[PDB]
Amino acid sequence: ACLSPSQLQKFQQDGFLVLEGFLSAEECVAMQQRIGEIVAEMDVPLHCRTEFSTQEEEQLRAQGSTDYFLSSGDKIRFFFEKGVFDEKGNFLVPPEKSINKIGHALHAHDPVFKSITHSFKVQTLARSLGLQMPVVVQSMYIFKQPHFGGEVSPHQDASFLYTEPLGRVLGVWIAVEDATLENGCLWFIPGSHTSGVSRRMVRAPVGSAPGTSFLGSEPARDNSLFVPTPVQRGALVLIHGEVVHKSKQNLSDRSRQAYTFHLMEASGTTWSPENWLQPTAELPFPQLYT
Ligand SMILES: O=C(O)CCC(=O)C(=O)O
Ligand SMILES: [Fe+2]
C-alpha cells in the first residue's frame, strides 16, 4: 500500500519501481476470469468484419479502425495483433485468440477492474506518493498472446498522455500472470525519466479529419541500456511518465496478461487537448480517492 522512504527514493532515481506481491493470486484470478467473460461476449469490430482487396477498402478499413480507437477513451474495446491477418484482412486464428489489448475504460465500466483500480492498496500507494487530485485517465488489459504476442517498442507514456507540466502522469502495471524474460516482460532504462520527451502523438483537432500522427521522433537509444524486470503474478510496477520502457515479443507457450491504468495529478496540471484521449461528458477522468 504505502511506500517506504527507501522505495520512494528508488522510484525517483530509476523512474520505475517493482513491488512484488502487491496483489494476491485471487485478485489476479478475478481479473483473468472477468477478462475471459468479456472476450467471450466480444463482437468483432465492424472494420474487422469486412475483408479488403483494393486500397479503396483497405484505406476505409484503416479509417474506421482509427475512429474506433479515437472514441474508445470511455469504452471497453478490442484491439488486435497487427500480424494476425492475411493479406485480404482475414484472421489467421480465431479473433478471441488474436486480441493484443482491451481498453480503454475497463476501470470505469467493469465492476471487477473498477474495484481493483480504486482498492485500498492502490489509494494508499497513491497517497504515499503525495498525489493530490489523482484521476484515472485510461486503463488497458494487455494479453501478450503466446508465440506472437506483439512487442511494444521503446517509448515514454507522456508521449501519448501529454500534460503541462510533465511529471504529472503515472502508470500502474499489474502482472496477472508471471512475466519472464521468455514471455515478454518489461524492460526499462533506469534514470531516463529526467529529460522530458522527444516525441508526442497528436489527434486532428476540431475540423473533422479524424486521425493521429507524431511530432518529433523516438531517438534511437543504446539497447544495452535496458534492464529487464521479470516479475511474479500479483506484482505492481510503478511507471514514471517519462521513463523509457519496452517489452519484447512473446515467443513462449504461455501468455503474459497484465492490467494497467494511468493516473494524472489533476492538481495544477493541464491535460493537453492534442492527446488522442480526451475525457467525455459521460466519463470525465474519475477520481482515484474514494
Ligand atoms: O505490457 C507491456 O508490455 C507494455 C505496457 C506499457 O508500456 C504501459 O502500461 O505503460
Ligand atoms: Fe508504456
User: Measured between alpha carbons, how far is 258 from 102 in angstroms, rounded to an integer?
Assistant: 11
For the Cβ of 173 lying below 6 angstroms from any atom of ligand 1, the answer is: yes
CA distances from 136 to 84, 198, 261, 263 (A): 31, 24, 7, 5
Extract the C-alpha cell encoding 270: 493541464
Extract the C-alpha cell encoding 214: 507524431
> Can you list the domains of the chain with their CATH numbers?
1-290 (2.60.120.620)
Contact 155, 246 (CB under 8 A): yes
User: Measured between alpha carbons, how far is 214 from 199 in angstroms, rounded to an integer?
Assistant: 7
User: Measured between alpha carbons, how far is 57 from 60 in angstroms, rounded to an integer?
Assistant: 5
User: Measured between alpha carbons, how far is 85 from 48 in angstroms, rounded to an integer?
Assistant: 10
Method: X-ray
Q: Amino acid letter at 260?
A: T
Contact 19, 236 (CB under 8 A): yes
Counting from 1 in the atom list of ligand 1, the atom nearest the Cα of 186 is 3
Extract the C-alpha cell encoding 249: 515479443
User: Measured between alpha carbons, how far is 199 from 181 in angstroms, rounded to an integer?
Assistant: 28
For the Cβ of 238 lying below 6 angstroms from any atom of ligand 1, the answer is: no
Contact 237, 261 (CB under 8 A): no
CA distances from 155 to 121, 164, 176, 262 (A): 28, 19, 22, 15
For β-strands 152-155 and 134-142, DSSP reports them as unpaired
User: Measured between alpha carbons, how far is 251 from 148 in angstroms, rounded to an integer?
Assistant: 6
CA 249 from centroid of its chain's CA atoms: 16
Mutate to test the pocket of ligand 1, among 182, 245, 250, 262 (most ligand atoms within 8 A of CB): 245
For the Cβ of 250 lying below 6 angstroms from any atom of ligand 1, the answer is: no
